Design a protein around this ligand. Sequence first.
Ligand SMILES: N[C@@H](CCC(=O)O)C(=O)O
Length: 468
Amino acid sequence: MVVTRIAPSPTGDPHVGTAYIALFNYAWARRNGGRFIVRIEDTDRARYVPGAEERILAALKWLGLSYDEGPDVGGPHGPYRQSERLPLYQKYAEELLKRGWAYRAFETPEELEQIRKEKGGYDGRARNIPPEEAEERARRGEPHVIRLKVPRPGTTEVKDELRGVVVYDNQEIPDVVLLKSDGYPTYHLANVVDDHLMGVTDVIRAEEWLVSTPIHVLLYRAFGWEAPRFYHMPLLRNPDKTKISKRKSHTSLDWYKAEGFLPEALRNYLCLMGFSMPDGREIFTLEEFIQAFTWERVSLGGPVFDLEKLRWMNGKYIREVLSLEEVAERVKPFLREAGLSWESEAYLRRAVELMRPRFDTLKEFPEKARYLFTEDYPVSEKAQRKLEEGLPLLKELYPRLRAQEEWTEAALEALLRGFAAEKGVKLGQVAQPLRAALTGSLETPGLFEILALLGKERALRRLERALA
Ligand SMILES: N[C@@H](CCC(=O)O)C(=O)O
C-alpha cells in the first residue's frame, strides 16, 4: 500500500509551495488507494511561529487536501510533530555510532571555519580520534555533533523516479551533521528515521532536496532499511523563471484566501503546475485530477506560477463553474469584512448577478460595488470632475426623473434618450454624469439597470446629494 506525506515546517505563513507539493502527494496516494499523512517538522525552535502549524493545517483543509494521520487527527505511528520525537533521533544517532556509520566531532565554530578555508569543507578529521576517547570526551560533557561517516573512497547511486539514476562519487558527499550539539537532529537524520517509522513508501518532495538524496540513501543503507521511491517535483517558478520568491510573487496561502481566490480555483491551478490533462482541459475537479494522474504527464521543466492566469481561472470559476447563489454565499464574508449588509437575499443575488462579469476575486466584489450596499459610498476624483462638468444637464434632468412614473430600465433609457435629443447632445454626455452621481464611479454595470435596481425614491433621494 502506497503511503505519502507532506512534511511542513511551521516557520511562517502557509506557503503556496507546500500546497503544490501536498497536492501531488494526496493525488498519488488517492489514485493508489493508499494513505496521505502530515508530519510537522518543528525542531527549529528559533524559527518556530506560534499558530503557524495550525494555519498550514487549516490551509490544506481549505484546499480539500484531507489527510489520514497527523498532529490533530492522530494516527497509529505518531507522535506527528518532530519536536515530540527528539529522543528517537538521539537513539538512532547512537545506533549509527555503534555500527561505525557515525562519529562524534568536537570542533568549535572557529575551528570549523579555519578547516573550511583550508580544505573547502569539513574534512572528517575527527574520524581519527580513538572511539573510546571520543566516548569519554562526550561523557565528560564536551560539546559536539554526530556526523555521518561516508565511505571514503566510494560511490552512491540514487534513483529519482522522474529523472533517472545519478551516480555520485562519495567525494561530493560531506560527513554531514546528523545530531546537533543541542541534541536536536538535522533534516537528514529526521527525514529518514521518520519516513521509515511512519511507513512512507513514496517520498514526493521539492526539487531543492534532490541533491541531498544520496545522504539519505546512505542513511537507509546504514540502518539496514529499505529505501522508498523518490520523486522530486519540478521547481515552482516566478514569472521570470527564477525559483518562486515572496519578492516577486505572493506565496502565502492566507493571502490568496483573504483576497478572495476560491480554494477550488487555486487548487485547480496548482494541478496545472506540474501536470497536463490528456485532452488539454484546464478546468476540472480534484477527482478528475486524481483519475487522470500519472507521473508520465508531469513535465520536469519547472512550472511558472502566474498570478494573471490564476486570476483568470478564478474568474472562470466565479462566472462559469459556480452557480449565482453559490457566488452570493461566498461574497458574504467579504461584505461583512467591508462592513456592509444587504437588505435581502434576493437583492444580494441581483447585485452579484449585475457584478459577476466585472470581478475576478471575491474581495473585488465589495470594493467595486460598495455603492450598492451603502448610501455613503466613495466618489472618485475622476467621477467628481465628470459629475461637475455635467451638473447643469443633471439639474435640468432632475425634474424629469421626479415626474417619472414608469421606473423600469427601458423607460429610464427612453427618458434619457428623449432628453439628450431635446438638449442636442449624445446620450453619453448625460449618462456618465448621472452614473457618477448615483455611484461615485464611471465604471459600473448597466447604468439603467442600476438606476432601476435601487428604486425611484431611493435613486432620486441619492441624486439630490450630488446637487449641493
Ligand atoms: N520540512 C521541509 C520538507 C521536508 C521534505 O519534504 O522532505 C520543508 O518545509 O522544506
